[PDB]
Amino acid sequence: KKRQRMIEVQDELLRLEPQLKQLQTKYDELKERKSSLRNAAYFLSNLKQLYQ
Amino acid sequence: HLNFLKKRLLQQCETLKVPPKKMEDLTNVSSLLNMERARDKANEEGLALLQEE
Numbered sequence: 001k002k003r004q005r006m007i008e009v010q011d012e013l014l015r016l017e018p019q020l021k022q023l024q025t026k027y028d029e030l031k032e033r034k035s036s037l038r039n040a041a042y043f044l045s046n047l048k049q050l051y052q
Numbered sequence: 053h054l055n056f057l058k059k060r061l062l063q064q065c066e067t068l069k070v071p072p073k074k075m076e077d078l079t080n081v082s083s084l085l086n087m088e089r090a091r092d093k094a095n096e097e098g099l100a101l102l103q104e105e
Binding site for chain 1: 102105
């Protein structure tokens with residue numbers, strides 16, 4: 001029964017292992033996108049003010 | 053007299069009846085126990101390792 005328990009715990013571990021990676025990279029890329037777009041909005045507004 | 057005693061005991065034990073229960077050789081069983089004990093110990097160790105994992 002402990003050997004079966006090995007089977008399910010290892011299966012759960014190997015299933016959950018990849019799940020972290022895509023979520024981590026998605027969080028990182030969305031945070032970078034948010035920062036970049038906020039900066040870009042700031043610069044476009046500021047340059048529009050300069051032009052006006 | 054002791055030879056007569058031995059032969060009468062042999063006849064009594066040959067005539068004696070027992071239910072069909074397997075009973076292994078008298079000398080070796082003890083050794084088996086030791087091995088069996090070791091087996092369990094090894095098993096327990098492995099069990100512990102498994103639980104540890």
